[PDB]
C-alpha cells in the first residue's frame, strides 16, 4: 500500500516542517513576561529551536498567553486571537493565567484563560521557571509530532 506509505511520509515531512521553527508571539501581560524574556536570554536559548521571538500577530504560530487576564483585557485579547492564521496553538503559561491563580477569588479576573481561548499546553509556575517553560514548548512539539491530519484526510 505505497499510496498509504506516501501519505504517511508526506505527513511526517509537513508536520516536521510545522513543528521545526514555530515562531511565537509573546503576548506578555505581567511578570510572566519577565520570565519569558529571561528565556529569551542568552542562557536558555530560543534560536536553537528555530523559535524567533517576534511581536508580529499576523504570522503567529503559537501564542504564549502569560501574565494575568482581566475583564478589561479579554475582548482585546480575543480580537488578537482572531486575526491569526487558523493553524495555531496556545501555551497558557503561569498560575495566574491557567486557572485564575493567586487572584482567583476576585473581580475583574477571568478565571483562567480557558474561558477565552482554547489551550493546548498549560504550564504552571509563579513564574514558571524558564527551564520549565522550555520543557513545555518541547512537549508542545511532541504534540505536533502526533497530529495525523493527512492520515485522516486520506482515509476520510
Amino acid at each position: 500500500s505505497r499510496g498509504e506509505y506516501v501519505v504517511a511520509k508526506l505527513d511526517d515531512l509537513i508536520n516536521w516542517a510545522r513543528r521545526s521553527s514555530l515562531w511565537p508571539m509573546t503576548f506578555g501581560l505581567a511578570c510572566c513576561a519577565v520570565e519569558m524574556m529571561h528565556m529569551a536570554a542568552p542562557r536558555y536559548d530560543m534560536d536553537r529551536f528555530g523559535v524567533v521571538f517576534r511581536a508580529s500577530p499576523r504570522q503567529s504560530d503559537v501564542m504564549i498567553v502569560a501574565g494575568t487576564l482581566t475583564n478589561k483585557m479579554a475582548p482585546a485579547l480575543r480580537k488578537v486571537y482572531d486575526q491569526m492564521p487558523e493553524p495555531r496553538y496556545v501555551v497558557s503559561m503561569g498560575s495566574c493565567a491557567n486557572g485564575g491563580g493567586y487572584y482567583h477569588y476576585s473581580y475583574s479576573v477571568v478565571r483562567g484563560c480557558d474561558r477565552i481561548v482554547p489551550v493546548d499546553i498549560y504550564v504552571p509556575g509563579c513564574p514558571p521557571t524558564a527551564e520549565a517553560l522550555l520543557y513545555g514548548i518541547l512537549q508542545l512539539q511532541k504534540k505536533i509530532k502526533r497530529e495525523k491530519r493527512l492520515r485522516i484526510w486520506y482515509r476520510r
Binding site: 480557558d114 477565552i116 481561548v117 482554547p118 489551550v119 493546548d120 497530529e147 495525523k148 491530519r149 485522516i152
Partner: peptide, 13 residues
C-alpha cells in the same frame, strides 16, 4: 470524534 484533535480543540472550552 474521529478527526484530528485540533477541531475538537477549537470547540473544547
Amino acid at each position: 470524534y474521529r478527526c484530528e484533535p485540533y477541531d475538537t480543540m477549537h470547540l473544547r472550552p
